């Protein structure tokens with residue numbers, strides 16, 4: 563089923579495009595969200611074990627996505643090991659902090675041994691060109707192709723040294739909007755400029771931000 567961000571197949575309508583996508587409109591624990599009022603808690607520390615890897619960079623008509631065929635890029639939180647499957651971007655950002663939208667967001671998608679999904683989100687402020695991302699922007703496909711990459715990538719560059727985060731439960735932000743996703747949104751912002759954000763938008767065809775969804779019964783832990 564075709565879905566998008568404008569016209570007849572836009573996010574207000576994803577619920578109705580298919581029975582498969584129903585949770586996009588009926589779900590009560592949907593992402594993204596506006597993080598406003600939080601409960602202060604004692605969150606387990608994130609340990610990151612990313613390394614130079616071979617990755618496949620994909621334009622899927624909705625996002626630019628960097629795929630990890632092999633394991634070995636992991637993140638450990640509360641003594642569970644989550645494997646990095648792929649990361650990708652939204653321009654502008656999807657999640658908000660006290661109403662604030664950022665020029666871009668990256669979502670680092672992981673699974674643990676029990677198939678439990680975990681997304682780590684970096685938010686990018688307006689600032690200087692991102693050097694560490696240039697490697698991806700240079701090979702970024704501008705149609706539904708894939709670049710197999712005798713170019714490696716080290717994703718550890720894309721994460722800050724300060725790994726303080728917000729924690730909540732939620733969903734995929736694209737159909738079928740599956741719930742049961744753990745969300746960890748890092749408090750420390752990276753940077754991009756307008757020319758990188760506009761280049762992403764050219765490639766992907768549109769702005770790919772789903773509107774914020776109500777928290778309902780969920781608490782955000784900071």
Ligand SMILES: [Zn+2]
Nearest residue numbers: 650652669735
């Ligand atoms: Zn995403």
